Design a protein around this ligand. Structure first.
Ligand SMILES: CCC(=O)SCCNC(=O)CCNC(=O)[C@H](O)C(C)(C)COP(=O)(O)OP(=O)(O)OC[C@H]1O[C@@H](n2cnc3c(N)ncnc32)[C@H](O)[C@@H]1OP(=O)(O)O
Length: 318
């Protein structure tokens, strides 16, 4: 069977799915179909500190040369007209309790994408927020302490996950996307899922951050390349770092899942799900490449239904 439901289930996927369908049952809209959330790939990686930061801080013994993390790719599918339609995807990076500072017990959303065919339309945004809120709730329970978001919308024609978006699906500019995450986090706050969130500038200030080595270092994030430039441009760049953090502060969220002294007393983070080896969905380039090479577009509902079928056949028949 090629259905989204028969894709391998996980605790993480089930938690998100249960939250979404719970919310949909409260809404009682007759157009809404069942939602399936599936983790389709999961692997362990390391991000290596780039050469400039490495020469300054790693070789003097002040910073780890690399940080291990688990990366997960997940998809949400909805029943529409009796078939599965993939409508949302997200990749995450999880730096567990064996990861050295400054990354210990942190999660980072690498990127997220969607195709706007969720039915009914009036519930689409709410469903996206429930998935994100569910993810924060889950990693909090496992023992992650801080979550990180970079609110950077794609450039015109740069598909993040889904090849060929619908032509009439508008791309939010930074201001709209920032408020969209704020709305999501405000709802997470009201449910006691997060303790607070802050911008990166306010966070560094409260932490009295004085060196670039204290800034969490994530694969593909803004800051490692900024830091390479600060070291090339050139002495202590800490003053300029605060100007850079301040200039871009609205787009960089720091989310506190736990706060206070408990954060140094938590048990080890042990992931109850196995890794899921799926080269096609690990990273974004493979799936984009495959869809491009096979003319799998998501630019209308009919094409999205077809491309979802083809993706499910690929996922099942490795
Ligand atoms: C940390 C790293 C990451 O998370 S990646 C950064 C976020 N990811 C992306 O931007 C990928 C592409 N974007 C998307 O897939 C979606 O926009 C996401 C982010 C999922 C949000 O979708 P959604 O919940 O529908 O909110 P939305 O703001 O996109 O649409 C709401 C209404 O606003 C409109 N809108 C959008 N952009 C504009 C615009 N530039 N000018 C005028 N209007 C705009 C939309 O048309 C939409 O209208 P409507 O009220 O739903 O009919």
């Amino acid at each position: 069977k090629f259905s989204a439901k028969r894709l391998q289930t996980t605790r993480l996927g089930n938690h998100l799915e249960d939250r979404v369908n719970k919310f949909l049952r409260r809404q009682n809209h007759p157009e809404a179909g069942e939602v399936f959330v599936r983790v389709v790939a999961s692997s362990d990686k390391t991000v290596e500190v780039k050469p400039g930061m490495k020469s300054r801080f790693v070789d003097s013994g002040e910073m780890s040369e690399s940080f291990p993390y688990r990366t997960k790719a997940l998809f949400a599918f909805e029943e529409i007209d009796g078939v599965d339609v993939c409508f949302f995807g997200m990749h995450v990076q999880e730096y567990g309790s064996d990861c050295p500072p400054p990354n210990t017990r942190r999660v980072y959303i690498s990127y997220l994408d969607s195709i706007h065919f969720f039915r009914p339309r009036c519930l689409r945004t709410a469903v996206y927020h429930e998935i994100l809120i569910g993810y924060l709730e889950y990693v909090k329970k496992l023992g992650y302490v801080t979550g990180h978001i970079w609110a950077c919308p794609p450039s015109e024609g740069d598909d993040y996950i889904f090849h060929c978006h619908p032509p009439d699906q508008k791309i939010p500019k930074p201001k709209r996307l920032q408020e969209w995450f704020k709305k999501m986090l405000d709802k997470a706050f009201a449910e006691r899922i997060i303790h607070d969130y802050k911008d990166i500038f306010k966070q560094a200030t409260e932490d009295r951050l004085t060196s670039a080595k204290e800034l969490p270092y994530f694969e593909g994030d803004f800051w490692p390349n900024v830091l390479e430039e600060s070291i090339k441009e050139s002495g202590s760049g800490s003053q300029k770092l605060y100007a850079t953090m301040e200039k871009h502060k609205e787009v960089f969220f720091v989310i506190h899942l736990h706060a206070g002294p408990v954060i140094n007393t938590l048990p080890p983070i042990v992931d109850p799900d196995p890794l899921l080896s799926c080269d096609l969905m690990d990273g974004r380039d493979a799936f984009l490449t495959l869809a491009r090479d096979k003319h799998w577009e998501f630019s209308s509902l009919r094409r999205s239904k077809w491309s979802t079928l083809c993706m499910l056949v690929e996922l099942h028949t490795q």
